[PDB]
Amino acid sequence: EMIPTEEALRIVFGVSKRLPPVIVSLYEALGKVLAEDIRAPDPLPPYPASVKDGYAVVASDGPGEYPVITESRAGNDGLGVTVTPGTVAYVTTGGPIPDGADAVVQVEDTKVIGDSKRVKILIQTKKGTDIRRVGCDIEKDATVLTTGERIGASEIGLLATAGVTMVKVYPMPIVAILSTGDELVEPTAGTLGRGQIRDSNRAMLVAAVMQQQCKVVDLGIVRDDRKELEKVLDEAVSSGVDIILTSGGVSMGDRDFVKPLLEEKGKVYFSKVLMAPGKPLTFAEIRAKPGKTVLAFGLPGNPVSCLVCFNIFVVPTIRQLAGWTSPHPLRVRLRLQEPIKSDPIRPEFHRAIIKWKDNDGSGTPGFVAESTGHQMSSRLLSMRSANALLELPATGNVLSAGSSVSAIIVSDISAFSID
Amino acid sequence: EMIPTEEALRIVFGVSKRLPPVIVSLYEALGKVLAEDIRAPDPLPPYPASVKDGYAVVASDGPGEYPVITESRAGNDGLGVTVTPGTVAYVTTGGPIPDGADAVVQVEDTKVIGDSKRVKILIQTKKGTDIRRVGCDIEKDATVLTTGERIGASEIGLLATAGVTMVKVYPMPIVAILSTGDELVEPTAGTLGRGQIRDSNRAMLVAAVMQQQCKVVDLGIVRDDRKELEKVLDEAVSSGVDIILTSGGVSMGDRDFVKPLLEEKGKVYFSKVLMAPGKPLTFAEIRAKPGKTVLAFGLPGNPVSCLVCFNIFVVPTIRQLAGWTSPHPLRVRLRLQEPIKSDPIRPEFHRAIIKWKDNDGSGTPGFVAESTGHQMSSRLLSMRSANALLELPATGNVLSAGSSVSAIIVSDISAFSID
Ligand SMILES: Nc1ncnc2c1ncn2[C@@H]1O[C@H](COP(=O)(O)O)[C@@H](O)[C@H]1O
Numbered sequence: 062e063m064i065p066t067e068e069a070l071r072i073v074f075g076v077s078k079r080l081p082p083v084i085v086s087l088y089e090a091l092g093k094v095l096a097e098d099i100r101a102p103d104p105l106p107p108y109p110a111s112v113k114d115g116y117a118v119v120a121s122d123g124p125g126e127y128p129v130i131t132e133s134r135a136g137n138d139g140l141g142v143t144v145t146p147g148t149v150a151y152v153t154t155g156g157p158i159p160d161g162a163d164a165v166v167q168v169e170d171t172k173v174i175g176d177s178k179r180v181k182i183l184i185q186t187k188k189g190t191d192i193r194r195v196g197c198d199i200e201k202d203a204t205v206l207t208t209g210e211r212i213g214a215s216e217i218g219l220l221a222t223a224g225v226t227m228v229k230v231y232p233m234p235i236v237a238i239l240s241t242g243d244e245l246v247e248p249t250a251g252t253l254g255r256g257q258i259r260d261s262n263r264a265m266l267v268a269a270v271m272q273q274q275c276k277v278v279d280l281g282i283v284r285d286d287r288k289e290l291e292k293v294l295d296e297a298v299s300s301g302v303d304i305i306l307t308s309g310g311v312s313m314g315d316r317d318f319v320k321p322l323l324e325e326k327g328k329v330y331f332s333k334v335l336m337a338p339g340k341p342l343t344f345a346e347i348r349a350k351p352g353k354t355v356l357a358f359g360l361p362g363n364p365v366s367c368l369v370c371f372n373i374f375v376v377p378t379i380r381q382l383a384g385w386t387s388p389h390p391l392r393v394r395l396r397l398q399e400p401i402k403s404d405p406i407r408p409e410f411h412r413a414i415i416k417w418k419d420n421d422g423s424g425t426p427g428f429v430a431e432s433t434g435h436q437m438s439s440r441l442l443s444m445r446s447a448n449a450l451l452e453l454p455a456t457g458n459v460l461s462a463g464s465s466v467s468a469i470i471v472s473d474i475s476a477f478s479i480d
Numbered sequence: 481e482m483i484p485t486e487e488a489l490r491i492v493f494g495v496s497k498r499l500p501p502v503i504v505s506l507y508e509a510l511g512k513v514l515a516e517d518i519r520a521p522d523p524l525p526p527y528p529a530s531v532k533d534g535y536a537v538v539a540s541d542g543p544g545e546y547p548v549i550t551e552s553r554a555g556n557d558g559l560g561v562t563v564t565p566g567t568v569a570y571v572t573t574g575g576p577i578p579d580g581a582d583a584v585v586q587v588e589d590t591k592v593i594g595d596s597k598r599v600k601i602l603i604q605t606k607k608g609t610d611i612r613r614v615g616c617d618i619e620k621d622a623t624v625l626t627t628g629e630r631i632g633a634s635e636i637g638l639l640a641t642a643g644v645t646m647v648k649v650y651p652m653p654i655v656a657i658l659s660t661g662d663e664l665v666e667p668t669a670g671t672l673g674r675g676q677i678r679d680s681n682r683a684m685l686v687a688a689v690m691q692q693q694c695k696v697v698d699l700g701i702v703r704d705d706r707k708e709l710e711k712v713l714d715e716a717v718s719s720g721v722d723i724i725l726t727s728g729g730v731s732m733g734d735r736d737f738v739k740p741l742l743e744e745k746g747k748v749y750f751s752k753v754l755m756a757p758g759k760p761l762t763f764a765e766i767r768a769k770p771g772k773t774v775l776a777f778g779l780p781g782n783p784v785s786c787l788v789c790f791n792i793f794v795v796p797t798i799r800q801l802a803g804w805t806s807p808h809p810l811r812v813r814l815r816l817q818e819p820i821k822s823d824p825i826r827p828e829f830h831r832a833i834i835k836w837k838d839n840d841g842s843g844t845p846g847f848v849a850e851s852t853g854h855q856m857s858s859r860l861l862s863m864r865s866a867n868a869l870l871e872l873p874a875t876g877n878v879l880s881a882g883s884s885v886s887a888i889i890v891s892d893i894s895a896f897s898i899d
């Protein structure tokens with residue numbers, strides 16, 4: 062009944078569907094994937110523009126003293142004026158080139174003469190120098206952005222260039238989160254009573270979903286009572302969320318009602334994965350009453366297993382729903398800074414702190430990994446500062462320091478601390 | 481008057497000061513750097529906890545049939561009951577181990593006997609098996625998080641474990657943004673008049689600052705009038721922001737008032753950097769009237785130069801103000817997928833799309849880079865999809881395909897599209 066992670070991932074990918082596109086404002090489009098192509102309605106620059114502060118000249122005139130017949134910085138400056146041979150115009154960078162001028166001489170290659178305005182051009186320039194012709198940066202009707210492209214700051218800049226302030230994008234999924242267990246108390250609890258622990262998974266998962274830029278619906282702690290969990294799941298399913306995340310209540314306990322309830326409400330595709338940590342992971346698809354599908358992840362209760370399963374299975378599902386064409390995490394190859402013993406049955410997602418070094422140990426640059434120590438699934442300190450999961454195959458052998466392994470990068474690579 | 485980028489960066493680092501710490505709620509602490517150590521007020525688990533669903537036994541009893549004297553899942557279950565030799569207790573994962581039991585036998589190694597409750601233990605277990613002793617995951621008073629540590633989802637989980645819902649952190653800086661130019665129109669403009677372009681830098685910088693998780697104060701378009709820009713800068717300086725970003729008005733134009741105004745209001749440390757793109761970058765420190773310092777970046781107007789300067793100089797300043805101990809960007813080494821001509825004077829921050837390959841061209845894994853094409857500073861399409869800036873030294877020689885270069889990673893490495 063235990064499936065490999067690669068098959069569990071394929072199943073999730075095959076069930077997960079891109080959400081219907083929506084229209085958002087400019088700053089709401091940041092971080093989203095475009096659901097339409099964007100075409101420039103006019104060229105950039107829309108007028109021949111100076112690259113420099115200086116003088117617009119007729120290049121064939123060459124060096125000499127000339128009257129300054131207009132000044133062109135913006136708008137209608139120099140409208141109706143023709144720079145004829147034997148004249149020049151002052152220009153600032155981005156200023157429209159007056160008719161008749163065919164090159165710009167930067168101010169450093171000129172000198173103002175006299176105490177009316179006259180200037181000495183100190184060089185022989187070439188036709189077209191320091192002029193941006195109409196549309197040289199962006200041609201009118203060119204496609205500046207395409208469908209399936211994620212919007213970052215430069216793409217916001219291109220949308221603003223093209224005058225697009227309402228954008229068609231794929232939305233982020235809305236995610237409901239709950240915790241299960243009679244042992245749980247809220248994390249505001251002070252002195253714990255006997256047999257109680259603070260609910261850490263819910264806040265951890267709320268934060269994890271906030272890092273994925275999705276809206277969170279926090280459904281709180283649910284006790285180990287089948288009727289109660291059914292009511293919360295029925296309410297989560299009908300609320301309009303796209304994903305439901307539960308943690309706990311999915312092992313072999315006599316009060317673990319997540320799996321049987323997901324079996325009753327929808328289709329469970331799997332409930333056990335061959336992996337360390339994260340064995341009791343359940344995945345289901347539930348149809349909400351009319352009109353849409355809801356994906357449910359019955360995450361394991363052990364804090365480490367909970368976050369690892371979120372990182373490996375939930376993040377790519379969020380990205381797929383959000384229209385990402387490349388939802389898979391970044392996988393790199395790296396060298397171990399210390400020896401690690403692999404398990405003989407379950408492949409391990411071993412937590413590590415990775416960094417780029419000029420010498421990775423082999424004499425050339427590369428990533429290196431330090432284990433976070435003891436990997437027990439109950440030990441959330443093993444996730445502390447972990448920016449990667451080393452994919453250790455189930456060989457049972459000690460992988461020595463300096464051996465090469467594959468690693469899944471789980472936290473912003475541009476936020477990596479340097480060596 | 482033109483300083484190397486490394487010196488411009490050192491100056492910015494030496495002037496930039498970490499902001500005073502603040503107290504925020506749990507979910508507000510996400511993405512922030514801790515400004516206090518966090519100690520566990522109680523152990524995890526606070527009671528001896530079962531690792532499995534099954535039966536708590538006296539290990540020395542060994543295999544046999546035994547009465548089930550209590551059931552322990554949470555809270556006060558089994559309080560006052562002693563598991564004596566010849567008895568067992570039912571336990572669920574995370575359930576408190578009753579007094580007297582010293583090992584757990586998972587339910588798969590047991591069988592319920594009879595139609596009162598009796599169970600057959602099918603194995604010989606060892607003392608301490610499948611029990612988490614008090615504090616084995618986290619010891620009472622252990623430091624679970626330290627000052628200078630950035631808070632991600634696992635660190636939120638550790639704060640919730642320790643019952644911390646109000647956290648001392650370094651805040652993010654508040655950033656004011658404005659654009660300058662008589663040629664600019666709002667990006668809502670439809671048909672452009674002569675000599676007008678849409679303001680793209682402001683939205684681009686607003687988005688860039690939003691990606692850095694800072695609050696934005698949008699000060700709009702300012703015209704090329706010294707008195708007007710002075711009023712907006714005086715108002716930005718006195719508003720409570722920590723950083724002011726302007727773009728444009730910093731080249732050699734006769735109406736470029738950013739540098740002289742920053743010289744008049746504060747201390748300009750530099751106004752020209754030896755780099756391609758981004759030559760006219762100005763940096764100043766202004767004291768606000770009582771009581772604090774404001775950092776001002778006079779960013780270049782050319783869209784590419786504007787974003788590149790933001791990425792290289794502003795991002796690490798934001799991170800330093802926000803208490804990051806490693807504010808520098810991730811720098812990797814990679815192989816070029818195509819030839820690139822380097823400039824003979826100015827070192828270039830060449831935009832590229834980088835990806836990790838199993839074969840980088842040299843036969844071993846590594847990053848490879850594709851140029852985004854023409855690198856003119858007016859061409860914002862050169863930033864499109866650019867996740868890195870290749871640091872090309874000023875040699876004037878053609879760096880062929882397959883040569884190794886240093887690259888600054890500018891966009892989330894965990895958001896990288898795979899090969
Ligand atoms: N929300 C939670 N936060 C912290 N630990 C949890 C949470 N839910 C379950 N656990 C623990 O995870 C383990 C497995 O839980 P379960 O799958 O409900 O048996 C037990 O040790 C639970 O006490």
Ligand SMILES: Nc1ncnc2c1ncn2[C@@H]1O[C@H](COP(=O)(O)O)[C@@H](O)[C@H]1O
Binds near residue numbers: 661731
């Ligand atoms: N906000 C803006 N958005 C787009 N282009 C700009 C902006 N500000 C300045 N520019 C252009 O950048 C170049 C340099 O501007 P400046 O430094 O003001 O001379 C000129 O081509 C300007 O038209």
Ligand code: MOO
Binds near residue numbers: 336338340361363438
């Ligand atoms: O059963 Mo696990 O893989 O320790 O959550």
Ligand code: MOO
Binds near residue numbers: 759760780782785857
């Ligand atoms: O003067 Mo630049 O380096 O094209 O902004």
Ligand SMILES: [Mg+2]
Binds near residue numbers: 242362
């Ligand atoms: Mg439970």
Ligand SMILES: [Mg+2]
Binds near residue numbers: 155
């Ligand atoms: Mg200007």
